[PDB]
Amino acid sequence: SQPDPAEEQKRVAAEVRFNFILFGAVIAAVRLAPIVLKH
Amino acid sequence: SQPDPAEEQKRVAAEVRFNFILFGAVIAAVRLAPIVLKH
Amino acid sequence: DRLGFVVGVVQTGFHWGFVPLVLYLGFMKGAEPGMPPLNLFSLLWQ
Amino acid sequence: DRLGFVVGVVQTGFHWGFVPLVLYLGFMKGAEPGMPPLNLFSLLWQ
Amino acid sequence: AALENPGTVEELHKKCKDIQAITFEGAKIMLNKGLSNHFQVSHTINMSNVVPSGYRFGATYVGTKEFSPTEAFPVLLGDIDPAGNLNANVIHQFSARLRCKFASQIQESKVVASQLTTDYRGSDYTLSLTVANPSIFTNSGVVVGQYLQSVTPALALGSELAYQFGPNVPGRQIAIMSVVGRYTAGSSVWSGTLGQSGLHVCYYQKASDQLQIGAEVETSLRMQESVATLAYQIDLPKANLVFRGGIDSNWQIFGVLEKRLAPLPFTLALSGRMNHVKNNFRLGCGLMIG
Amino acid sequence: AALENPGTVEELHKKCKDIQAITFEGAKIMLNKGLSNHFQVSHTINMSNVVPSGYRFGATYVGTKEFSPTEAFPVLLGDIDPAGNLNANVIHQFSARLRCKFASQIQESKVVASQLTTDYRGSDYTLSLTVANPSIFTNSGVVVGQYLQSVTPALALGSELAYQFGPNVPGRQIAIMSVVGRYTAGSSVWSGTLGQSGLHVCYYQKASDQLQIGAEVETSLRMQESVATLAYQIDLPKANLVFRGGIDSNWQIFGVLEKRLAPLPFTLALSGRMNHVKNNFRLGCGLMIG
Amino acid sequence: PLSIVRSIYNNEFQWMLVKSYGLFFLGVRLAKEFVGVELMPS
Amino acid sequence: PLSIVRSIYNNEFQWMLVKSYGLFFLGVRLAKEFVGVELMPS
Amino acid sequence: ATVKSVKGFYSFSCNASWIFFTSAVILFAPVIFETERAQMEELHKSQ
Amino acid sequence: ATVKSVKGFYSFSCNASWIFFTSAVILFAPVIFETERAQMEELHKSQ
């Protein structure tokens, strides 16, 4: 009856985009970090 | 009916003693050879 | 396919031509201006 | 058998005793008369 | 302010792989001939009991009028065996900052592995993007984003995101973010990376010009496998000698002696690896002629 | 008249086996310690990939008050591994004539091979008798009679009769008479033996102290198998170097370097055998310390 | 505690971890001691 | 004579003989030429 | 079983010495050999 | 089949060169290397 067990596959895709935003956020953090540390 | 195929075995023994007398004869020959060669 | 052929062609050209290309650019420069020419014997032995 | 036992005994004595025998005759002679004694450390270190 | 450029994420993970010894097995001969400072040719003969024996022929070209620095780009290097298996590397500088490397390995008349890498350098930071093993006909392939910034003159921090698509990946796409950092503490350069899966940490310790020591740990959180190494290098120009040897936490022990034999530019390498798990020892020896 | 003693039949058959190289596989370490001119101890460590790898401990004793010459008999020499496999040799002199050698190899707690040999050295001739691998409980074993006489100062001739008894022999007893000779005009020395069942010939030739060349053929008339070798030795004290290498008519090629490293009594040994039939190379390296 | 520690030694990953982190930190101790060492000194 | 000589080459012992006596006599020819040779001469 | 226990300790201590001495022959000994030889060379050169 | 005949000759030329050069690397080359190095050492010593 199921068309596809898509949910696990799309949740993995959701975690992939979550990894992307986390990768960006850590770059944003370190891009702020030296000012925050020297401030 | 045969007691033993002894003939081949005893012929090998005969050749073994033949090797012994040949070994002796070549020693006897070389023991004579230098005299024969200087003679 | 246009790429179906061109990709195999270009990769075959890289595959066989890269060492030919390095050698060609080498003999294009040659030796130093004061050195004897790079005869192909210099590829074959010291 | 007399030899059935004595042969195995004597070969076992050779087997384990030959290196013991060589070592014993060595330490019997020892070093040269002017050299330090052959302490058993001579078997173990340079 | 006025920080260094930190390098690149691959140079942190390689940071302690330079002193780790590279053992080889069997007899290997290499002859190098410098035809010009732009053009070099190398003939290498590999005889081994278990490594595939054979000749391979190598040539290198470098330098063109476009590129000013002593790096003397482009670099155009490749070596091929009589069976036709090609290894080749290409390196380019779209500018003084943006640098590019390309490498491809062909065997069985097929490209078995390839990667294209881009490396960009700022006064305080580095950014790089890599693509590798691409399908040309399909979306499938490997992609890696990497970032690294100097945060204090003794400390750098950064980030990495590897990605893959297609049938080689268990999920149709997967990616792994992983933090990265390095702390210098003078000699005691710490390095490592913490992933959403896996961890790696170098320790590196230059004792002196004559002695360099490092250590590693690796770990994987979905694969449940981990290893470590302790490795050292000795450099002895007083003895025309270098030695790299290290213990493996899987109890391989390796040492790769190499001697330069004279001012005459022969070097002799002796390679020993003992697998103490298997009581197995693999010897290699080889001569390099400059 | 007053000819040389010709040596013994085993020295003819060995005549060209001294320059034939003895290759080895893997890494072998040997330490020799001289405890006195009568007593020497040697520790040998062999790490090897397929050759059995381990340790064995060796000791040698020589000389007693009975024996005057610089040979300093008796000789009493043996080396044992921690598994208990013993190799040992015994040599004795009932006089200057009637020298005796004994050797036995014990492994798996069993005598696997042994021989006892006499030499009688009779001015212009030699006579020798050997017994080997004897059963003690049964008549079975090996016997060899050998004779060799100098016939002219350039030429020697002789004879040999090997014999065996028992289940190891296909006939209940077998023996093979075989003539032997040697000729020595100029630098060249010929040698060989003609048997009822085989033939062997050395050719040997000193070119100079730096270069010695020999060749072999072997043949068997009941086994239908034959081989040959061409082998040479280079001695280069200027290079602290000796090299033995030869072609085998089964197309193995072998070379065994040894380098004395210094007045300090290390010698490196480098052993290469390539089986060109199997394209198979076996490397060995080893260090002897005097 | 052999009833405890053997339960690690018996288990591959937990032991692989202990081995790897052990030799690593041993390397850290050794390295921090080695910092003054030279083999054929100036 | 390839019909003749191949009948030897095809047969193991006969070829083993030819190889062994061949390389042997080649060694004799070489050795009788090498008699004057030195490698790092005095 | 005391003798068998001694055979146990022996075979263990034999193996332990094997692993140690083979490892040293790889890791340290090549350095020791060349460093010693270089030191004796310097000694003879300075002697 | 000319190309295939050239592939035949070529692969034979591989074997012939392979067997020759691997053999020389065993039999002769170790002598050549050390003899050359000793001669260059004598040259530099005499220079």
Ligand SMILES: CCCCCCCCCCCC(=O)OC[C@H](COP(=O)(O)OCC[N+](C)(C)C)OC(=O)CCCCCCCCCCC
């Ligand atoms: C004394 C100082 C100077 C010395 C100078 C030495 C020069 C090098 C001598 C040969 C070395 C050697 O070993 O070559 C050996 C090779 C053949 O080996 P292979 O095919 O691997 O054999 C094993 C076969 N497999 C691999 C299938 C298992 O021969 C050759 O065909 C190369 C000869 C040199 C030609 C260079 C151009 C090659 C272009 C190849 C394009 C595909």
Ligand SMILES: CCCCCCCCCCCC(=O)OC[C@H](COP(=O)(O)OCC[N+](C)(C)C)OC(=O)CCCCCCCCCCC
């Ligand atoms: C991890 C390893 C474990 C195994 C044991 C290691 C022992 C370590 C030894 C250290 C010393 C050392 O390597 O020396 C190697 C020596 C160097 O000394 P030299 O020749 O006198 O030159 C220096 C002169 N000096 C000593 C006065 C300073 O060069 C050789 O032999 C050269 C060999 C050339 C041939 C190479 C092989 C070619 C292929 C195969 C041919 C059959």
Ligand SMILES: CCCCCCCCCCCC(=O)OC[C@H](COP(=O)(O)OCC[N+](C)(C)C)OC(=O)CCCCCCCCCCC
């Ligand atoms: C660096 C200085 C300190 C050295 C301390 C060494 C302690 C060794 C304890 C062994 C525990 C162990 O591993 O025992 C278990 C091992 C075997 O299993 P495994 O190794 O897990 O292999 C399985 C791997 N898997 C998990 C991936 C499947 O047993 C053995 O037969 C091998 C023991 C080899 C010891 C080598 C020691 C080298 C010392 C070098 C010194 C110069």
Ligand SMILES: CCCCCCCCCCCC(=O)OC[C@H](COP(=O)(O)OCC[N+](C)(C)C)OC(=O)CCCCCCCCCCC
């Ligand atoms: C500079 C050093 C050069 C070394 C050259 C080595 C060549 C090795 C080739 C192996 C091929 C092979 O397979 O050889 C073996 C087979 C023959 O035996 P088979 O038919 O397999 O029967 C099974 C084996 N039996 C018969 C023992 C049971 O072929 C040959 O004998 C043909 C090879 C001829 C080589 C000629 C070389 C001439 C050299 C002259 C300078 C000394």
Ligand SMILES: CCCCCCCCCCCC(=O)OC[C@H](COP(=O)(O)OCC[N+](C)(C)C)OC(=O)CCCCCCCCCCC
């Ligand atoms: C039966 C009577 C034996 C008498 C022995 C007397 C000698 C005692 C010495 C220890 C022997 C031992 O214990 O060595 C044990 C081991 C070998 O063990 P293995 O089991 O063969 O290893 C292989 C395992 N196999 C059997 C399953 C395949 O070798 C060693 O570690 C080498 C010891 C080298 C000592 C060097 C001393 C000199 C150093 C100079 C300065 C650097």
